[PDB]
Amino acid sequence: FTEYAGAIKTITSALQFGMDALERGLVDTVLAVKLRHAPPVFILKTLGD
Amino acid sequence: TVGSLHEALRQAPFRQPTYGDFLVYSQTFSPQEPLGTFLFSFKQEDNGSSMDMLLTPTSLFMLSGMEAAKAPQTHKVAGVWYGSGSGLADFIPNLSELMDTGEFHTLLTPVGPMVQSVHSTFVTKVTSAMKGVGLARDEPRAHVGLTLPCDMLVDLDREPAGLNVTIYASLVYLRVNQRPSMALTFFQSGKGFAEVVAMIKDHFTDVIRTKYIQLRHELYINRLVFGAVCTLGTVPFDSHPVHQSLNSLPVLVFANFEAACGPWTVFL
Amino acid sequence: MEATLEQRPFPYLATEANLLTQIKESAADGLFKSFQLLLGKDAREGSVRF
Amino acid sequence: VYTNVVEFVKFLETALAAACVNTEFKDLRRMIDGKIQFKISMPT
Amino acid sequence: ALDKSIVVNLTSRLFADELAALQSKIGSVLPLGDCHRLQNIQALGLGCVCSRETSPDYIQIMQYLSKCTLAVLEEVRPDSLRLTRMDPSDNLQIKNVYAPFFQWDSNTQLAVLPPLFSRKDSTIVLESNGFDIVFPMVVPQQLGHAILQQLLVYHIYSKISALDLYTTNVSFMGRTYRLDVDNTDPRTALRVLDDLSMYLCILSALVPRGCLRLLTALVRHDRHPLTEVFEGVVPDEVTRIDLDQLSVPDDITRMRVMFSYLQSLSSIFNLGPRLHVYAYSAETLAASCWYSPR
Amino acid sequence: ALDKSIVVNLTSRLFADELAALQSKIGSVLPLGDCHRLQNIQALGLGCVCSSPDYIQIMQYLSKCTLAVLEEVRPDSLRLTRMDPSDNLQIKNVYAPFFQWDSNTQLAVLPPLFSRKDSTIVLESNGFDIVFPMVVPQQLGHAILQQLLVYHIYSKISAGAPGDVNMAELDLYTTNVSFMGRTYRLDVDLRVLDDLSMYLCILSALVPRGCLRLLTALVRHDRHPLTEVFEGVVPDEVTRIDLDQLSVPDDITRMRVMFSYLQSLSSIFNLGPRLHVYAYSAETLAASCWYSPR
């Protein structure tokens, strides 16, 4: 009983850190999109006027 | 989710490895053998039909006769386990003539790593693995990986790798002190068979020149066989060898080594 | 623009009369254009994409 | 036995999401492409 | 069981002109660098060694190919290539697309070879990324070796020359095919010829004398079918070896040693990984092979 | 899980004498033309190509085959079992003549070449003859051929010139095979090896011309340094072959022939329908193994 409970608390928790890995991956890939369309200040300012 | 993965892991048991029960004279197999030692087999005659002979890479160093120049570290270990080698060498009376005509590599059949060996006084039980990942026989299942010394293993290295890197076994006949004596090294590359045979020839550049010049006053046709390469099994790529010192003796140990076999192929 | 064939999983209709007679000959020598064979391990509705 | 539990994060509860319009799409593996055709008229 | 595929990120996009080639060659075989899931284009090209700016190395390309994994295309999206890989023992379904058309059958024996019939045909370019995806080709082993037979003959008779119909063309039964050999880098193919020269002269010192005498009694008495490589004229060198007497117990110690070196010519006539076909269809061009490397 | 059973349905029943021969051979290794589970008797055994046979047209049939194992002979229908690669089995040593397999050895599959009383089984009720392959331990299978290959040459030397072959010398070291501390008698009066005696002899004169034409082309500042040693092993008479007496478009015909025998003779001994026995008993003739193709 303390061994069947010592296994399902590892298999579900490893999926909790797999489910955590996507919300961490959402913020990474949005910021990966925002930086690949991010020209710096010294280029854009004279183009912006 | 939890419920969909609750069933998708139940339906996959992996196959079990095979087991070859070996039964050895206890004077040809030391008690202090590291669990994970690679093995061999020698089955010259057939009249006894009772007991079997096994050779470690440490015990084969006593039968070979390669000096401590090309192999210093096991020479301390092969002597401290076998004094004069009389417990080993008395069984084979042709240890100077099998090295002449080149028939020793045809008799060895590689087996694999150890599993469980109960040491005994007269007849030592030995269990090894031939296929599959090296696992234990009994209830305390411990994953026994294959162990090689740093003295015998010679590595071959952008290198694009597949799902495969293999371990070989070269066995090269030569003559030191004007008496025949073989030499054995271990390789590790996943380069395919068409490259390693072109690479082992560059590992023995300064050896072929120091035989055929030494044997030009008299040369025999039965001397022309020079080596034999087997194929011992596959290592999973991205798994690293682990350095380990044992009473000392630096020994590399692999993990997840599944074992196979192969025919001995001549190269020159 | 020539009208082509496509394997998109249409809601097909069934006709009372049959079709199947002499079709096996007609693949080898073309009775009709715009045909594509399908073997039974891959004769299905494809996954719809757009 | 002493364990730690890492702090979990939500995407929509971060202030990053002012720079994104967020529509959940159920079967994106069934998509090939997408497009937005702008039509800019111009005065003179 | 085992759920596998490979999706490949094209880093920016790709055009509609170059998509017409990647769509036309679906169901083909190409290698790739490492067995990841997610992947860039700079591993799928076989022409990371078959470059345009330098001359290629036909042996080194083939020597590269027993290393890497092999993969099959199934779908093409204009930003992502979706493939499937080949486990070392896995019954899959391959399709015969490859443009020099050689008919297969059930229980044939395939081989994966570098593109040697045409370089420009099997190398399509992707200048949206500055890279060219280079396809290999599958060939049955009756020409799996018979191109490597012809290629090793060519590098011998280039140094002697430095005629042009016997040293280049490859003869399958029925037809001939011109190789695409114009500017090569033979500095790793002459090592291979320096690895025939050791095994071949050893096989010229322990030639069994009984088999030499059977040539003296066959090229002038009867007319065998394949003795017509020779004429009736025997070589003069065979009689200059024949003059020593026979020895039956020394045609065993010469036959056994000669037999051991012909296990060694499976180290220089190696192909890539092989495809044991067990079921083939003729009007669908779809086979079902069994991958097994080495 | 997976299922495998190859039921061979018969037309007519088996007789009493026809059945008791196959009762003893209840465990064996047999070739088979395809892997679908309902076939006739004309698809198993080597009699598809063997029933004036050749060696090579059977050796290029075993490595391109799917071998099956007998388990049961019921009087209306045979039954087989398919053999996967890397599959545990249970083989009964039943083959004629007897050879005494040693445990922990390697077993190869070779075509039969002795008299027909020991190999085939004549079935009168259905008019087909099954042909078993010859399962030999792999060291003896490379040894039983390399002496009869010598013996078939001296059967052709003594047919044209009798004084060169001595029957006291020939039938003394070509009828005893010293292997595994024992000897074995062989029943030989051949027709199976009538091509290897010609392929090894048509290769026998092309090697001395070959290993000088290949060495005159390979000489430069960057020779591979091992062939400085292996230049001396060739005899002095081979080093005086003047190749002026053969033209350059004749020399190409003496290379593409030459290399093609060097491969196709070397390949038929590195063909591996072989199986590694791990357990055996002598007085029961039981054995277990695993299979690994090519």
UniProtKB/Swiss-Prot annotation, chain A:
It is found in: Virion; Host nucleus. Transmembrane segments: none annotated. Self-assembles to form an icosahedral capsid with a T=16 symmetry, about 200 nm in diameter, and consisting of 150 hexons and 12 pentons (total of 162 capsomers). Hexons form the edges and faces of the capsid and are each composed of six MCP molecules. In contrast, one penton is found at each of the 12 vertices. Eleven of the pentons are MCP pentamers, while the last vertex is occupied by the portal complex. Homomultimer. Makes the hexons and eleven out of twelve pentons. Interacts with triplex proteins 1/TRX1 and 2/TRX2; adjacent capsomers are linked together in groups of three by triplexes, heterotrimeric complexes composed of one molecule of TRX1 and two molecules of TRX2. Interacts with scaffold protein; this interaction allows efficient MCP transport to the host nucleus. Interacts with capsid vertex component 2/CVC2. Interacts with the small capsomere-interacting protein/SCP. Belongs to the herpesviridae major capsid protein family. This is Major capsid protein. It comes from Human herpesvirus 8 type P (isolate GK18). The lineage of its organism: Viruses, Duplodnaviria, Heunggongvirae, Peploviricota, Herviviricetes. The chain holds residues 149 to 197 of 1376 of the full protein.
Swiss-Prot record, chain C:
It comes from the Viruses. It is found in: Virion; Host nucleus. Belongs to the herpesviridae major capsid protein family. Self-assembles to form an icosahedral capsid with a T=16 symmetry, about 200 nm in diameter, and consisting of 150 hexons and 12 pentons (total of 162 capsomers). Hexons form the edges and faces of the capsid and are each composed of six MCP molecules. In contrast, one penton is found at each of the 12 vertices. Eleven of the pentons are MCP pentamers, while the last vertex is occupied by the portal complex. Homomultimer. Makes the hexons and eleven out of twelve pentons. Interacts with triplex proteins 1/TRX1 and 2/TRX2; adjacent capsomers are linked together in groups of three by triplexes, heterotrimeric complexes composed of one molecule of TRX1 and two molecules of TRX2. Interacts with scaffold protein; this interaction allows efficient MCP transport to the host nucleus. Interacts with capsid vertex component 2/CVC2. Interacts with the small capsomere-interacting protein/SCP. This is Major capsid protein. It comes from Human herpesvirus 8 type P (isolate GK18) (HHV-8). The chain holds residues 1 to 50 of 1376 of the full protein.
